Amino acid sequence: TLSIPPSIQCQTEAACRLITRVTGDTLRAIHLYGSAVAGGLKPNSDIDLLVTICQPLTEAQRATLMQELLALSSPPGASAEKRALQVTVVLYSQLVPWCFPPSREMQFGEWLREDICQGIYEPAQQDWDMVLLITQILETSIPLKGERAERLFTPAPAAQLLKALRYPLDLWQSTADVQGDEYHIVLTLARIWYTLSTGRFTSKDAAADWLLPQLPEDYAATLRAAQREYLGLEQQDWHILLPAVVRFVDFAKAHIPTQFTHHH
Numbered sequence: 001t002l003s004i005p006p007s008i009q010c011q012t013e014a015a016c017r018l019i020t021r022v023t024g025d026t027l028r029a030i031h032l033y034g035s036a037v038a039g040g041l042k043p044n045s046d047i048d049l050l051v052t053i054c055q056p057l058t059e060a061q062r063a064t065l066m067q068e069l070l071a072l073s074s075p076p077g078a079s080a081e082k083r084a085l086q087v088t089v090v091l092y093s094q095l096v097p098w099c100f101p102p103s104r105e106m107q108f109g110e111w112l113r114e115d116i117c118q119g120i121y122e123p124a125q126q127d128w129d130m131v132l133l134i135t136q137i138l139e140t141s142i143p144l145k146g147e148r149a150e151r152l153f154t155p156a157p158a159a160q161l162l163k164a165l166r167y168p169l170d171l172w173q174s175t176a177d178v179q180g181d182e183y184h185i186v187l188t189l190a191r192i193w194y195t196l197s198t199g200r201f202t203s204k205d206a207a208a209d210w211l212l213p214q215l216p217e218d219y220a221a222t223l224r225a226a227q228r229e230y231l232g233l234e235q236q237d238w239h240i241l242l243p244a245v246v247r248f249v250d251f252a253k254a255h256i257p258t259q260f261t262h263h264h
């Protein structure tokens with residue numbers, strides 16, 4: 001039985017209590033997922049939460065939830081006891097039965113603090129990553145509210161999981177597509193490659209270790225630098241590394257499988 005890390009139990013309980021109070025009778029479930037449960041919880045890591053609701057939130061509820069989550073969350077790395085929160089809200093009707101691509105009602109995150117602090121909220125929108133979120137939750141998650149994931153959601157067809165995995169791959173193209181997110185994108189490409197090759201999901205760090213000995217050394221050096229920064233061991237100048245990041249992205253677009261090698 002998967003366990004909530006003691007060091008996030010208090011904050012996680014407070015988030016669960018807030019989400020429960022604001023959503024009320026529409027709440028179907030709350031699931032903890034991501035590196036807190038699957039492994040690889042770093043000092044800058046956020047706490048990943050999926051909220052499943054039955055009906056869309058009112059305009060006032062969205063504002064209440066967004067504003068109060070701001071007070072429960074801190075920028076990543078600002079505090080060892082008050083982590084960044086990521087809260088994704090989805091309609092049950094978008095997942096059972098599946099809609100492809102599924103829509104997400106709402107997303108809270110620290111990368112939106114400046115907008116959210118002004119009352120600017122993302123509307124409901126289509127998100128291919130929701131297929132990957134649910135797939136990961138089906139394997140590794142904890143129900144803070146409601147039923148365990150395997151009793152609530154069904155697996156997506158492999159054909160849709162493939163499309164969800166390759167969607168960001170086709171979108172990363174230019175220097176500006178990757179600028180500001182260099183090591184994140186390099187590591188996520190490693191996780192995508194891993195999943196398409198083995199059918200499984202794994203941590204950012206472990207995916208980098210899996211891919212490294214398979215790469216020509218020039219691409220291994222870029223992956224090693226992204227891994228080393230993510231592990232907090234060295235902050236690179238990613239403006240100098242940008243051309244090598246672009247080459248890494250192109251290499252992954254050329255070499256990552258176009259079909260599962262080993263389904264999920």
Ligand SMILES: CN[C@@H]1[C@H](O[C@H]2[C@H](O[C@H]3[C@H](O)[C@@H](O)[C@H](NC(=N)N)[C@@H](O)[C@@H]3NC(=N)N)O[C@@H](C)[C@]2(O)C=O)O[C@@H](CO)[C@H](O)[C@H]1O
Pocket residue numbers: 086109111129168172176177178179181184185188
């Ligand atoms: C939804 N989670 C947050 C989000 O992550 C995103 C992150 O997405 C980033 C793209 O790579 C980048 O090319 C894109 N850059 C562009 N020039 N388009 C970013 O804008 C995008 N970030 C974003 N929408 N907040 O890369 C994806 C693989 C992701 O992990 C999930 O869809 O954005 C990250 C910051 O960019 C946050 O750290 C995450 O918590």
Ligand SMILES: Nc1ncnc2c1ncn2[C@@H]1O[C@H](COP(=O)(O)OP(=O)(O)OP(=O)(O)O)[C@@H](O)[C@H]1O
Pocket residue numbers: 034035036040041042044045046048129132133165188191192193195201202203204
């Ligand atoms: N093959 C993949 N395996 C895992 N995550 C993937 C994959 N492809 C894309 N992603 C997406 O990348 C994002 C990773 O989430 P997130 O950045 O919170 O990472 P994490 O594993 O929880 O680590 P961290 O401790 O840095 O938060 C999710 O949106 C996830 O769906």
Ligand SMILES: [Ca+2]
Pocket residue numbers: 034035045046047048
């Ligand atoms: Ca996370």
Ligand SMILES: [Cl-]
Pocket residue numbers: 039040041
């Ligand atoms: Cl860990």
